[PDB]
Every structure is written in C-alpha cells, then in structure tokens.
Amino acid sequence: MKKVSVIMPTFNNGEKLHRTISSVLNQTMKSTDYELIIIDDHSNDNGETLNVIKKYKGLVRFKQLKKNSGNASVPRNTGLKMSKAEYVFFLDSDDLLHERALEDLYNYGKENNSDLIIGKYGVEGKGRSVPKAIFEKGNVAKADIIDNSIFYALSVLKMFKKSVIDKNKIKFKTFSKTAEDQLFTIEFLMNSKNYSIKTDYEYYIVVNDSTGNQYFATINEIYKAIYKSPIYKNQEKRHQLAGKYTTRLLRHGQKKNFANSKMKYEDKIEWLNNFSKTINKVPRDSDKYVTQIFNLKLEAIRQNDLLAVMIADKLL
Amino acid sequence: MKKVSVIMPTFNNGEKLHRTISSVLNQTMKSTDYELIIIDDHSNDNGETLNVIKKYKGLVRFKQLKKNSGNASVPRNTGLKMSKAEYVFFLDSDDLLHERALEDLYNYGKENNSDLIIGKYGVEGKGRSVPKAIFEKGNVAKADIIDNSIFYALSVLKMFKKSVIDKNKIKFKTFSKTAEDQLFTIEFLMNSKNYSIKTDYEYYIVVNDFSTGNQYFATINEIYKAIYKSPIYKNQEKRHQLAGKYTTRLLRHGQKKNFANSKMKYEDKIEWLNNFSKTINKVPRDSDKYVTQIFNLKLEAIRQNDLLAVMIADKLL
Amino acid sequence: MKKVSVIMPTFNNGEKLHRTISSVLNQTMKSTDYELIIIDDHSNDNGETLNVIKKYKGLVRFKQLKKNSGNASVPRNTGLKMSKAEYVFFLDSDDLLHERALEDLYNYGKENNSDLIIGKYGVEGKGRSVPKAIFEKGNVAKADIIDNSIFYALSVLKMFKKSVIDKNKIKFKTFSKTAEDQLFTIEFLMNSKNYSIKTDYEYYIVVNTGNQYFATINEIYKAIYKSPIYKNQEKRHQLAGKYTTRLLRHGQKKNFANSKMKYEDKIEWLNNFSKTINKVPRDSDKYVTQIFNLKLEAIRQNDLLAVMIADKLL
Numbered sequence: 001m002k003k004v005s006v007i008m009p010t011f012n013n014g015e016k017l018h019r020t021i022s023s024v025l026n027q028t029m030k031s032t033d034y035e036l037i038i039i040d041d042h043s044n045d046n047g048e049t050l051n052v053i054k055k056y057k058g059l060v061r062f063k064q065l066k067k068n069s070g071n072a073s074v075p076r077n078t079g080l081k082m083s084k085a086e087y088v089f090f091l092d093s094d095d096l097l098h099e100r101a102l103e104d105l106y107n108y109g110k111e112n113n114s115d116l117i118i119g120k121y122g123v124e125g126k127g128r129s130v131p132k133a134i135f136e137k138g139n140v141a142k143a144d145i146i147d148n149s150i151f152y153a154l155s156v157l158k159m160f161k162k163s164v165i166d167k168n169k170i171k172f173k174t175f176s177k178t179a180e181d182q183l184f185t186i187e188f189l190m191n192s193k194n195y196s197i198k199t200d201y202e203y204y205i206v207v208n209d210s211t212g213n214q215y216f217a218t219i220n221e222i223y224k225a226i227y228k229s230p231i232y233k234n235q236e237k238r239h240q241l242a243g244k245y246t247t248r249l250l251r252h253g254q255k256k257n258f259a260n261s262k263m264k265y266e267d268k269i270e271w272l273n274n275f276s277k278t279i280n281k282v283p284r285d286s287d288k289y290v291t292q293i294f295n296l297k298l299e300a301i302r303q304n305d306l307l308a309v310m311i312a313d314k315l316l
Numbered sequence: 317m318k319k320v321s322v323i324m325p326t327f328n329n330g331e332k333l334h335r336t337i338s339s340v341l342n343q344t345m346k347s348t349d350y351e352l353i354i355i356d357d358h359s360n361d362n363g364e365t366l367n368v369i370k371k372y373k374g375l376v377r378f379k380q381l382k383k384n385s386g387n388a389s390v391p392r393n394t395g396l397k398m399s400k401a402e403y404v405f406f407l408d409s410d411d412l413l414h415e416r417a418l419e420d421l422y423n424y425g426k427e428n429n430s431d432l433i434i435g436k437y438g439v440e441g442k443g444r445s446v447p448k449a450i451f452e453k454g455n456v457a458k459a460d461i462i463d464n465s466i467f468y469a470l471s472v473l474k475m476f477k478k479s480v481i482d483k484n485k486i487k488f489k490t491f492s493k494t495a496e497d498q499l500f501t502i503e504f505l506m507n508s509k510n511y512s513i514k515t516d517y518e519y520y521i522v523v524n525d526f527s528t529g530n531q532y533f534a535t536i537n538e539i540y541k542a543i544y545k546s547p548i549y550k551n552q553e554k555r556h557q558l559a560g561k562y563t564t565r566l567l568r569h570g571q572k573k574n575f576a577n578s579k580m581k582y583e584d585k586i587e588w589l590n591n592f593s594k595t596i597n598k599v600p601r602d603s604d605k606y607v608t609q610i611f612n613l614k615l616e617a618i619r620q621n622d623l624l625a626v627m628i629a630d631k632l633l
Numbered sequence: 634m635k636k637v638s639v640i641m642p643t644f645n646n647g648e649k650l651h652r653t654i655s656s657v658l659n660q661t662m663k664s665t666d667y668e669l670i671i672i673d674d675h676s677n678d679n680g681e682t683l684n685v686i687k688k689y690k691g692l693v694r695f696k697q698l699k700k701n702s703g704n705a706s707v708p709r710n711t712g713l714k715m716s717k718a719e720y721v722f723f724l725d726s727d728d729l730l731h732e733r734a735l736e737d738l739y740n741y742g743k744e745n746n747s748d749l750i751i752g753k754y755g756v757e758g759k760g761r762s763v764p765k766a767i768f769e770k771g772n773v774a775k776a777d778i779i780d781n782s783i784f785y786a787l788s789v790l791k792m793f794k795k796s797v798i799d800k801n802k803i804k805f806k807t808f809s810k811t812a813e814d815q816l817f818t819i820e821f822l823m824n825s826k827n828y829s830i831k832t833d834y835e836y837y838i839v840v841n842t843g844n845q846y847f848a849t850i851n852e853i854y855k856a857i858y859k860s861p862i863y864k865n866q867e868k869r870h871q872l873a874g875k876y877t878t879r880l881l882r883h884g885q886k887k888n889f890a891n892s893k894m895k896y897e898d899k900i901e902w903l904n905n906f907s908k909t910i911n912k913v914p915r916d917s918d919k920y921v922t923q924i925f926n927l928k929l930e931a932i933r934q935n936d937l938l939a940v941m942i943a944d945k946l947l
C-alpha cells in the first residue's frame with residue numbers, strides 16, 4: 001500500500017505535459033512510496049498527448065477513456081477507483097509540484113493525523129489567482145474552516161485521506177461543468193475533522209496558459225452537504241458555515257456581476273431565478289454570518305428582485 | 317399652594333439616591349415653596365432603596381406602589397395626582413439638580429408666563445448624550461418648536477405648568493415601554509403656547525451609570541394624532557410642518573433607526589416595517605415636503621413598505 | 634419658385650421682432666430668391682407685435698391666425714402650406730440669422746443634394762444652451778445620425794427640402810406643447826438620406842402629468858421603427874437606443890423622481906413614461922449608454938423608488 005497516489009487527468013496537453021510529469025517523478029519522497037495515475041480523457045490532438053505519456057510507460061499507471069467526458073470529474077473518479085494508497089493528491093495536467101511536496105505534506109499529515117493537507121499555492125502567468133489568506137498564518141496542524149479561510153481554498157489540488165473518501169463514498173459529480181471540485185472538497189470537509197496547512201514552500205504551482213440550471217444545482221448540493229454534516233452537527237455551526245460559504249459565493253462566484261452585465265434581460269431573469277430558488281432553500285439564520293457589505297445583495301437575491309441586485313452591485 | 321412639585325419615581329436605586337435627594341433639598345428656592353414627591357415603583361432590593369428614602373421622612377412626600385409598573389409612567393402619574401403646585405418638575409432617580417434650578421426656572425417661567433421651562437442639560441459619564449441645539453441661542457423667553465429644536469429635546473425633565481396638565485387631562489400612557497415621555501411632552505406642547513429656555517447653568521445633570529414595534533408605533537401614532545388635533549396649532553399647513561419636523565427627528569434618532577440592514581430576523585424586520593409603514597401612512601403626504609430632503613427616499617420607502625428600498629436608502633445615507 | 638422660404642411664427646414679440654426681421658431681410662442671398670413668411674399666432678399685446686410687422690408690408694408675406702394656437706405647430710404648418718420654395722427654413726421670432734445663412738446653407742445643400750442642412754448655432758444670454766457636438770467635426774457633406782450626434786440637435790431651426798415634407802405629408806403635430814419639433818425632425822430624418830452640416834459661421838443665433846408629452850415620444854419611436862430609409866431592424870434598435878439615451882440626458886423633467894413634484898403626479902408621469910418605453914423593443918437597450926442601464930430598467934419596471942435611487946447614483 002503506497003503513501004500517495006497522484007491522480008492527474010489529461011486532455012490535449014501536448015509537449016507541456018513533460019514538465020508536469022517530470023515534477024511528479026522528481027520528488028524527495030521514496031519513488032516506491034507513491035504512484036502517478038494518469039487518466040487521459042480521450043485526447044484528439046493527433047496522438048501528441050498520448051505520445052508524451054507513452055515516454056513514461058513503466059513509470060506511471062495509465063488508463064484512456066473511450067469518449068471525452070468534457071471535465072475532470074470522470075477521469076478523477078477513475079483515478080480514485082484505481083488508487084489503494086493512504087492519501088491521494090489531485091494534480092491538474094498543466095501544473096507543477098515542488099520537489100518536496102509529497103514528502104512534506106504526507107509527513108505533516110501523518111504527524112497530525114490529518115484527513116486533509118493543503119500546501120501553499122504558487123502561480124505562474126496572468127489568469128486565475130490562487131488563495132493567499134489561508135497561508136498567511138504559516139503552518140497550522142489543526143486548522144479551522146472559518147478562522148483559516150478554507151472556504152476560500154476549495155480546489156481539490158490537495159492531499160486527501162483515501163479512507164474518508166472510501167468510507168463516505170465521495171465521488172466527483174458530473175451534473176455541472178463548474179463547481180464540482182468545490183462540492184467534492186466541501187463533502188470531504190463536512191465528513192472529516194483534521195485539516196492541516198503547510199506553507200514552507202510553494203508546494204503546488206498553478207500554471208496559467210449559461211442559464212445556471214446546472215450550476216445552481218451544484219451550489220444546492222454544497223449547502224445540503226453542510227446542513228447534513230455528521231461532523232458539524234450543531235445547527236448554529238451549520239448556519240455559520242453556510243453563511244461563510246454564501247459570502248465566498250458572493251465574493252468569487254460564477255457571473256457574480258451578472259446583474260449590470262451585457263447579458264440579455266431574459267437570461268438575467270432566468271439566472272437570478274435559479275440563484276433565488278437555491279438560496280431560498282438555505283435558512284435565513286445563516287444570513288447573520290454573511291459579511292455585512294453583502295447584506296443587501298443577499299436579500300435582493302432572496303427577493304428575486306433584479307433591480308435590487310443591480311443597485312446592490314452599484315453600491316459594492 | 318407650592319411653586320414647584322419635584323416628582324421623582326424610584327426603583328432599586330440604593331445609596332445612589334442620597335446624591336439625588338440631597339440635590340433637591342439643597343435648592344436656593346425657599347424650602348417651604350416646593351416639595352419632593354417620591355414614588356417608589358415597588359423596589360425589591362432588600363429594602364435598600366426604601367431605607368435611603370426613610371432617612372428623609374418629613375422632608376419629602378412618599379408613596380409606594382404595590383406592584384412594579386416596569387417604567388416611570390404609573391409612578392409619574394401618581395406624583396401628578398399628588399401635586400397641587402403651580403409647576404411640576406420631573407426628575408429621574410439617578411440624576412441631579414443644580415442648586416439654583418427650581419428658583420431660576422420658576423422665576424424665568426413666572427416672568428414670561430411660561431407653560432414650559434427647559435433648563436440646560438449637563439451629563440456625567442459615558443452613555444446617553446443630551447440635547448445641545450436647543451440651548452445654542454442662550455436664553456429664550458418665547459421659544460418656537462421648530463426654530464429652537466424642541467422636537468430634539470422631548471424628555472419630561474423640565475418644568476411644566478400643572479394647570480395645562482390638569483385642564484387637558486394629560487397622563488403618561490402605559491401601552492409602550494418607550495417614547496411615552498415624548499408623547500407626554502408633545503401632548504403638552506400641542507396644548508400650550510409659551511415655552512422658555514434657560515441656559516445660565518447646567519440646571520439638570522443626567523448621570524450615566526456603569527420588539528416587533530406594535531406598541532412603539534402605537535405611541536408614534538399618538539404623537540402625530542396630538543399634532544393634527546392641536547387646539548393651539550390649528551392651521552393645517554402648520555400641522556404639516558410640525559409633523560414633517562417630527563418625522564425628521566424620528567428618522568434621525570428613532571428607536572431601531574437602522575433596523576433594515578441589521579442582524580434582526582427577516583420576519584421581525586417585515587413586521588417592524590409593516591408597523592412603521594401603517595403608522596406613517598396615516599400622516600398626510602403634505603408633511604413630507606417639510607422633512608429634510610436627505611431622508612426623501614427613506615421616507616418614501618417606508619410609505620411603500622419596501623424593505624429592500626429602506627436598506628438601500630440607509631446605505632446611501 | 635424661390636430657393637428658400639423662411640417661416641417665422643410670432644406671438645407677442647413686440648419691438649424685439651425688428652432685430653429678427655432685419656436679420657432675414659439683410660441676407661447675402663438675392664432678395665428675389667427667398668421670402669419671409671410671418672405667421673402671427675393671434676398676438677394680444679395691444680397691437681405692438683402687429684405694428685412691428687406692418688412696418689415691413691411689401692417686404693414679407695403675412696397671415697394672422699384667428700385664435701392663438703398656443704405653440705408654433707399650427708403657425709409653422711400654415712407657413713408650409715404657403716411656401717412653394719425648394720427649401721424651407723424655420724426661424725423663431727426672437728432669434729437672428731447671420732448675413733450669409735441662406736446663401737451658404739442653400740449652396741452647400743444644392744452642391745451635396747442635401748435633404749437637410751444644419752447651420753452651426755450660436756447663443757446670446759443665459760438660458761437654453763445649444764448643440765455643440767454635431768459641429769465639432771467641421772463641415773460634413775453626407776452626415777450620419779449616430780456618428781454626427783444629430784439626435785442631440787433635433788430643433789427645426791434648419792433648412793429642409795420641401796419636396797420631402799410634401800411627398801411624405803409631414804406636418805407638425807398639436808397633441809403636445811413640447812417635443813413636436815423633435816418629432817418633425819425625426820419624421821424628416823427617417824424619410825431622407827442626405828444630411829449636411831455647415832459650421833463656417835454661427836449661422837443661427839438663439840436669443841434668450843405627461844399624457845400628451847409621452848404620446849409625442851411614442852410617435853418618435855414609431856417613426857424610427859417604421860422608417861423606409863432605415864429598414865434594417867438592428868439599425869432601428871440602434872437609433873431607438875440612441876434616442877433613449879438623448880431622452881434620459883435631456884428629456885423634459887428628467888429628474889422628476891427626486892423633485893418637489895407631488896407623489897401622485899410622479900406616479901402618473903412615470904406610468905406614462907413606462908407605458909411608452911415598454912412599446913420599445915428591449916433589443917434597443919444594448920445601444921443605450923450604460924450609465925443609464927439602471928434608470929432605464931427602473932422606468933421599464935415602473936418602480937418609482939428604483940428611479941429615485943438610479944438618479945441618486947447618477
């Protein structure tokens with residue numbers, strides 16, 4: 001039984017994949033103590049990606065899907081079924097690991113009985129930004145969701161204890177193109193207690209290179225996960241978590257500024273209708289735990305009032 | 317017939333009452349010319365308050381209520397029934413009078429045929445602040461409600477002509493825990509003409525120590541009713557002006573003025589705004605033009621009973 | 634057939650009219666090539682205005698209306714029926730023409746086959762300001778409505794080809810006291826292609842519940858969306874959106890929502906504004922300047938509070 005399975009889905013990556021794979025194979029951890037599982041989501045780049053992967057035959061486990069799934073959910077789920085390790089680490093195909101990522105994160109995790117270990121993120125290039133606040137207090141052995149800003153770092157680019165995933169049958173959902181990674185991390189967080197944060201190096205480097213029916217279905221699942229948490233059983237604690245997630249959603253959500261956008265009016269109405277329907281399944285008791293700058297925007301969404309959301313956005 | 321009855325309700329004050337009572341007994345006014353009526357609202361402090369009051373038996377009139385009323389309304393009403401003086405002065409149990417408060421206020425009142433005399437307030441300690449604007453023009457023999465900011469000083473901690481109270485049967489109401497003193501002063505102001513302001517000393521020292529609105533807005537409703545039924549201010553346009561100015565004071569200093577963006581439960585906000593809307597919609601819109609224009613949107617939002625609009629209005633103030 | 638008929642309605646102008654009439658009679662154009670038609674809207678100023686007009690008997694055509702119409706619509710319509718010229722030029726009674734206004738504008742128009750020629754405006758005194766942006770690019774032989782800011786200069790104080798007015802039976806409407814001149818210019822613009830702008834001089838000097846108003850605004854949008862010149866629906870949306878922008882920037886009672894207007898009047902006004910704008914396709918909204926995105930939606934939603942707020946944020 002290996003310490004870590006690195007699970008990496010690929011799709012039409014080409015010669016860029018060399019850098020990523022190399023970063024995983026060049027770890028300070030004993031090479032026999034981890035594996036790299038590569039799951040190609042049926043690349044169609046005239047065999048360029050598959051040719052790069054073939055160069056590491058013998059040194060990595062590999063499966064190719066018959067049809068392209070469209071996102072990383074099915075590939076990652078396939079990797080999870082293939083792993084029998086203590087921890088898994090999800091890695092995106094364009095990104096890089098620091099030489100001492102698996103060793104340092106696994107050691108910290110093992111020494112603190114961690115269900116989840118989060119390594120400090122770095123970033124190369126303009127594009128997506130990475131979480132910063134979670135890492136501002138240095139290393140944290142027993143982190144807290146609220147006090148350590150974990151709802152602002154819900155990517156799956158972390159080390160997860162496989163037993164938690166297995167015991168609770170946590171899979172990536174495929175009903176949406178976005179926020180499926182958030183739902184996964186939330187499901188995990190709500191079914192575990194021990195989270196640790198390690199910040200000695202930039203362990204993971206992120207490399208930068210419609211009506212909302214499906215999106216808000218996923219957001220709904222996130223709130224459901226919080227309110228059904230067997231770890232956070234206290235209803236007031238659930239309200240606090242839900243409120244904090246609402247804050248993150250209003251700060252960093254998809255199409256956060258839809259109301260004053262160039263979007264067609266009928267589309268705005270349908271979008272807000274889905275956002276309203278979803279947030280109105282969340283107890284109002286959570287609202288008091290939302291950052292108060294968003295008090296008006298949140299009420300506007302609850303009331304399903306487009307004008308009020310437009311105004312709220314103008315005042316933010 | 318005495319010049320002044322000082323009416324002071326007490327409740328679980330203890331040894332703090334000595335300072336207050338002493339301030340009343342040590343007045344420059346002839347001691348035979350006034351009385352201190354003490355009405356204890358059934359203190360339950362192991363007889364501590366009653367023990368302090370007993371030390372002045374013979375120098376004060378005193379009645380104890382059988383059950384605690386909860387506020388100062390019933391006690392003050394009892395004091396009024398007991399007084400046969402020319403003027404009454406309401407004093408709170410923790411507060412102080414200046415040595416020359418009754419004398420100076422009574423003299424100014426008598427020399428100007430005043431129905432109401434307001435002495436400049438002082439304050440000791442962090443907490444509740446006191447009115448300032450009303451006293452910024454010095455002494456005023458014939459003051460005006462609007463021009464002298466009297467709607468921003470509606471406490472009953474003043475000298476009132478008893479005849480006005482008696483002739484018009486003015487009592488403190490008990491349907492609400494708050495704003496009952498405001499309603500009293502408003503009822504008095506709307507049934508009298510002569511108000512004087514005296515500022516030579518800090519005559520009254522306020523001492524600081526270290527709801528769905530059904531009843532509150534019923535009291536606010538009574539305030540508007542008092543203005544619009546005033547036999548002194550009979551001109552409808554004058555009533556609009558007074559009403560508008562009160563609306564301004566309510567939006568500036570009202571209870572839970574910032575309820576809309578508060579941590580109040582949504583259902584409570586709705587009920588609160590519903591009461592606020594129901595009440596303000598009984599006030600003619602003709603008064604709105606006399607409201608300070610910064611509040612134009614907030615006022616309309618309340619009239620329309622639109623929570624979102626009130627929230628926004630508050631964000632723009 | 635004369636080159637130009639200057640059409641000038643008068644009403645209780647008095648001795649101020651001398652200056653105006655003099656400015657028309659003192660043109661560089663051959664005096665036999667134009668006429669000044671004066672239409673008095675039944676002045677009642679103890680014969681003062683009529684006395685000034687009588688001094689130019691022989692030099693002007695003149696008709697007096699039996700009853701005062703209240704605005705310039707009926708008078709101007711009367712002038713149009715009286716003119717058989719190639720172009721007409723509407724002149725207000727207190728205003729002035731530059732010595733070389735008719736000549737320069739007619740020549741430019743004739744040389745560019747212009748349906749409409751717009752001379753640069755000047756202004757004397759505090760009050761109404763005049764369009765500026767339309768004239769910022771100098772002379773334009775073939776102007777464009779959008780690119781040359783013509784919706785910000787919709788007065789009829791311009792030179793119009795009479796054939797376009799007769800062929801399309803364009804009259805000033807009388808349903809409203811205001812915006813009737815705008816409707817006229819819009820009707821003209823939507824039924825012609827060739828517009829020219831001349832800026833060498835200040836050729837024209839301006840001297841200083843909404844049921845009816847919004848009926849007129851409605852006619853403006855109708856004119857755009859029925860235009861036989863601008864037939865492309867997307868072009869109509871663009872024109873409509875640009876007019877909406879001008880309406881929000883310079884409309885009558887633009888700031889009604891936070892005004893001293895009685896509440897009941899505000900509601901009725903906004904109701905008319907909402908009813909009218911909701912007959913305009915939402916496809917035009919994308920062509921409205923985005924600062925007005927909220928105000929426009931507020932009006933569409935007929936929400937007084939939202940209009941008040943919108944105005945507070947502008």
Ligand SMILES: O=P(O)(O)OC[C@H](O)[C@H](O)[C@H](O)COP(=O)(O)OC[C@H](O)[C@H](O)[C@H](O)COP(=O)(O)OC[C@@H](O)[C@@H](O)[C@@H](O)CO
Pocket residue numbers: 129130131132133134149151152153154155178179180181182247251252254291
């Ligand atoms: O006191 P509050 O909680 O109201 O305010 C919090 C502070 O203001 C705090 O300083 C900041 O929120 C912390 O922000 P940050 O500088 O640490 O960055 C965190 C951001 O959330 C981060 O840059 C991303 O927006 C979050 O991305 P991930 O959670 O890692 O997941 C990617 C996610 O966006 C992706 O799944 C979506 O594109 C698809 O739905």
Ligand SMILES: O=P(O)(O)OC[C@H](O)[C@H](O)[C@H](O)COP(=O)(O)OC[C@H](O)[C@H](O)[C@H](O)COP(=O)(O)OC[C@@H](O)[C@@H](O)[C@@H](O)CO
Pocket residue numbers: 445446447448449450465467468469470471494495496497498564568569570571608
């Ligand atoms: O906008 P305008 O020009 O019309 O007026 C605004 C001016 O700036 C105005 O002159 C100032 O507001 C006057 O303020 P101030 O400095 O004279 O006094 C401040 C307050 O009036 C005062 O501190 C209290 O807030 C008022 O309470 P009271 O009138 O003494 O009545 C007691 C009442 O609040 C009590 O019943 C409540 O606690 C129960 O709800």
Ligand SMILES: O=P(O)(O)OC[C@H](O)[C@H](O)[C@H](O)COP(=O)(O)OC[C@H](O)[C@H](O)[C@H](O)COP(=O)(O)OC[C@@H](O)[C@@H](O)[C@@H](O)CO
Pocket residue numbers: 762763764765766767782784785786787788811812814815878882883884885922
């Ligand atoms: O926001 P965009 O990009 O679409 O353009 C905005 C620019 O800033 C634009 O240049 C300005 O809005 C307009 O420039 P301007 O300095 O030439 O503005 C001229 C005004 O439109 C003018 O002072 C009058 O408002 C319009 O005169 P007319 O419409 O020709 O007169 C008849 C009618 O408007 C009049 O009855 C109304 O003013 C009565 O309220």
Ligand SMILES: CC(=O)N[C@H]1[C@@H](OP(=O)(O)OP(=O)(O)OC[C@H]2O[C@@H](n3ccc(=O)[nH]c3=O)[C@H](O)[C@@H]2O)O[C@H](CO)[C@@H](O)[C@@H]1O
Pocket residue numbers: 008009010011041068069070071072073075091092093094128155156157177178179180181206
């Ligand atoms: C840098 C970061 O925060 N990454 C997130 C970001 O990825 P990002 O926006 O960077 O997009 P990426 O190219 O990294 O794609 C994510 C991963 O999914 C794989 N892939 C992509 C397309 C496809 O059809 N099939 C497939 O398996 C890619 O090989 C890659 O490993 O948004 C994704 C979708 O919301 C998240 O799940 C990622 O964790």
Ligand SMILES: CC(=O)N[C@H]1[C@@H](OP(=O)(O)OP(=O)(O)OC[C@H]2O[C@@H](n3ccc(=O)[nH]c3=O)[C@H](O)[C@@H]2O)O[C@H](CO)[C@@H](O)[C@@H]1O
Pocket residue numbers: 324325326327357384385386387388389391407408409410444471472473493494495496497522
């Ligand atoms: C500085 C100032 O503006 N003071 C006001 C403030 O008093 P404040 O907030 O200072 O409250 P206080 O304790 O002074 O109460 C007012 C008076 O009521 C008496 N009391 C209190 C409780 C009780 O159950 N029974 C009873 O009789 C107290 O003895 C006291 O003399 O709010 C009161 C209630 O609106 C007003 O009447 C006071 O004018």
Ligand SMILES: CC(=O)N[C@H]1[C@@H](OP(=O)(O)OP(=O)(O)OC[C@H]2O[C@@H](n3ccc(=O)[nH]c3=O)[C@H](O)[C@@H]2O)O[C@H](CO)[C@@H](O)[C@@H]1O
Pocket residue numbers: 641642643644674701702703704705706708724725726727761788789790810811812813814839
């Ligand atoms: C500079 C400018 O754009 N002015 C416009 C403004 O006039 P403005 O506000 O400048 O008012 P004016 O004095 O120019 O009056 C407009 C003209 O209408 C005539 N008149 C006036 C009253 C009357 O009862 N009968 C009558 O015929 C006047 O003689 C005058 O020639 O509003 C009119 C109606 O929307 C427009 O046609 C004018 O172009």
Ligand SMILES: [Cl-]
Pocket residue numbers: 179252253254
């Ligand atoms: Cl999101």
Ligand SMILES: [Cl-]
Pocket residue numbers: 460461462463
């Ligand atoms: Cl007054």
Ligand SMILES: [Cl-]
Pocket residue numbers: 495569570571
């Ligand atoms: Cl109050």
Ligand SMILES: [Cl-]
Pocket residue numbers: 812883884885
């Ligand atoms: Cl207009």
Ligand SMILES: [Mg+2]
Pocket residue numbers: 092093094095206207
């Ligand atoms: Mg990536």
Ligand SMILES: [Mg+2]
Pocket residue numbers: 408409410411523
């Ligand atoms: Mg007190």
Ligand SMILES: [Mg+2]
Pocket residue numbers: 307308622624625936938939
């Ligand atoms: Mg609203």
Ligand SMILES: [Mg+2]
Pocket residue numbers: 725727728839840841
């Ligand atoms: Mg004029």
